[PDB]
Amino acid sequence: GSFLGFNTHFNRNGAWSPESAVAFIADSSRVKIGVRQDITVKFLDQATLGTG
Amino acid sequence: DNQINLAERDMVALRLKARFAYVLGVSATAMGANKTPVGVVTPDVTPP
């Protein structure tokens, strides 16, 4: 088992681009994701979608 | 072309409304038949 000393994460949602990268190695303290609003669902029943 | 679908554009709106009526009591007085209860001062539109 080769990758000791990394926290390893595997992309499984089909976002990976295998023609561009084999792997990214990063300092995780220096990457931040701002979550202004996490995924919210609204049920629509009266609304209109599209035009013409 | 002016259509805003609020839910599809992630918008909301307020609708504000009121219902009003007006009546002027033009009526007979002790002076006679068709008397108006309001007068007006109109602006000076004549140059010196």
UniProtKB/TrEMBL annotation, chain A:
The compartments listed are: Virion
Tell me which domain of life the UniProt entry assigns to the organism this sequence originates from.
Answer: Viruses
**Which protein is depicted?**
Major capsid protein
According to its UniProt entry, this protein's organism is: Mycobacterium phage Adephagia
Residues shown, of full length: 209 to 260 of 312
